[PDB]
Amino acid sequence: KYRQVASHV
Amino acid sequence: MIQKTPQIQVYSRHPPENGKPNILNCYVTQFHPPHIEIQMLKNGKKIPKVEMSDMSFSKDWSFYILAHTEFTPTETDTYACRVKHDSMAEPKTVYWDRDM
């Protein structure tokens, strides 16, 4: 399963 | 930022036999940026139905892709893969060789 990036750069 | 020149191998799925149907692969790796144009040709004419895998990249971030089409090797038919990429000041054509 794919997990999105938590926080912006 | 840094351009990486595609490395190209053109080769058959199975060892080629004159007259027998087979798959011709054009495997293009180690390039950046990802925009690339890849055609496969028989006797210098574009082959129409050419499948591309989804583009992916390696551990080292460099992009790769597989183009493939059906072909039947013969004594006199020649096949090639032609790649255009911004790293290259002209299109690179690689001719299929039986002995790769």
Partner: protein
């Protein structure tokens, strides 16, 4: 034995020509199993191996939603990176992410990955401790500090340890027939005239899975003069191919030996012409 789940994600900006193109590809070991490509009219996360096809709609929905969240994140990241780097506006740039988990015989997480690149170069990466970040540069340092304040490492760690390995396990179940196979290489040597003094010997390894292999020439049982070694390549039928070639003096062909190490070989092969 060891296994891996990995995702490879790329956004490329296309300024004046639309929103960045966004693609994510999923692999289990050397096998592709899923993708999401924004280029579609109604983009959805999608199966790319027969054995994923019987996953229900809730799987593709959830995965779609997560891919679309990342799409928006990648658009923001491209804008931000360009600002942090002081780059001229316009221009196509790329942001990439590679993530997933490795397991041993163990089914405890052996290694986890969460790494990123901008324009093809390292940007930031989670270290093997799964707690700290390596920033590739002064720009990525801003990001690191921000991910430190948010506690992102521990969040990713829970994924890496929990859901990542849990779903790798399911995938190996669903694809057990194919994913668990070992196809041993068929090897042979071909002889090609070079010149009145020499010839090329080409050692081939064909039809093997998984991709990993060692293929080499020796001269008198010592390792080995230039050798051409091509990059391991897909046959396109889920097996791989490789060859190594060496130019040899006429009449000393029998001196040289080809050697093939691979998981599906009981005993490493030695071929001689």
């Amino acid at each position: 034995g060891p296994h891996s789940l990995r995702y490879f994600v790329t956004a490329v900006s296309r300024p004046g020509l639309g929103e960045p193109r966004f693609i994510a590809v999923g692999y289990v070991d050397d096998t592709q199993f899923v993708r999401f490509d924004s280029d579609a009219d109604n983009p959805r996360f999608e199966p790319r191996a027969p054995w994923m096809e019987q996953e229900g709609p809730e799987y593709w929905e959830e995965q779609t939603q997560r891919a679309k969240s990342d799409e928006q994140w990648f658009r923001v990241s491209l804008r931000t990176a360009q600002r942090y780097y002081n780059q001229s506006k316009g221009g196509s740039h790329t942001f990439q992410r590679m993530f997933g988990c490795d397991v041993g015989s163990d089914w405890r997480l052996l290694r986890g990955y969460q790494q990123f690149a901008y324009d093809g170069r390292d940007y930031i990466a989670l270290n093997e401790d799964l707690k700290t970040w390596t920033a590739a540069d002064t720009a990525a340092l801003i990001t690191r500090r921000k991910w430190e304040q948010a506690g992102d490492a521990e969040y990713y760690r829970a994924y890496l340890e929990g859901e990542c390995v849990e779903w790798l396990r399911r995938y190996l179940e669903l694809g057990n027939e194919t994913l668990l196979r070992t196809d041993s290489p068929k090897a042979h040597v071909t002889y090609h005239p070079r010149s009145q003094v020499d010839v090329t010997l080409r050692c081939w390894a064909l039809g093997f899975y998984p991709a990993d292999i060692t293929l080499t020439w020796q001269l008198n049982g010592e390792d080995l003069q230039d050798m051409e070694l091509v990059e391991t390549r897909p046959a396109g039928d889920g097996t791989f191919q490789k060859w190594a070639a060496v130019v040899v003096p006429l009449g000393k062909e029998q001196n040289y030996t080809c050697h093939v190490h691979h998981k599906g070989l009981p005993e490493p092969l030695t071929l001689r012409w």
